[PDB]
Ligand binder design. Structure first.
Ligand SMILES: CCCCCCCCC(=O)O
Ligand SMILES: CCCCCCCCC(=O)O
Length: 133
């Protein structure tokens, strides 16, 4: 039920990403570079398995997961977390848990754009991605 999320997406707007990174303890030099990076996110499916790639000039990540099945993840900032991704209200909700901490990465399609909302602590970042042909 994931299908309009699938494809290649490019970052076209970012709000409060520094706040989000700082909440997670990312160092200032990394936050500089990340504030000027525009990743490409690729979301593909094969049966029940999704693969989500995030590519940039700085750092790259890739995860594969089944919806609703927990997986181990090592994040771009090197947190070792327990993750689960589900559909909720048509949104792709990714929850990461580590050391009793929790962050959510929520993706929603609005007017054909993919809106990624990142929440940790009180920090709320909104990143907008537009689809590549
Ligand atoms: C500081 C942790 C950053 C983790 C990944 C954030 C993802 C951002 C993105 O995909 O646009
Ligand atoms: C996977 C590309 C993400 C680029 C921006 C965020 C990097 C954050 C970090 O390294 O701590």
């Amino acid at each position: 039920m994931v299908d309009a999320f699938l494809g290649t997406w490019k970052l076209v707007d970012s709000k409060n990403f520094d706040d989000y990174m700082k909440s997670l303890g990312v160092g200032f030099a990394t936050r500089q570079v990340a504030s000027m990076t525009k990743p490409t996110t690729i979301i593909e499916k094969n049966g029940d398995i999704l693969t989500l790639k995030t590519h940039s000039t700085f750092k790259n990540t890739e995860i594969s997961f089944k919806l609703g099945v927990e997986f181990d993840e090592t994040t771009a900032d090197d947190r070792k977390v327990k993750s689960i991704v589900t559909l909720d209200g048509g949104k792709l909700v990714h929850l990461q848990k580590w050391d009793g901490q929790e962050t959510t990465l929520v993706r929603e399609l609005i007017d054909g754009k993919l809106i990624l909302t990142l929440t940790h602590g009180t920090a709320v970042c909104t990143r907008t991605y537009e689809k590549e042909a």
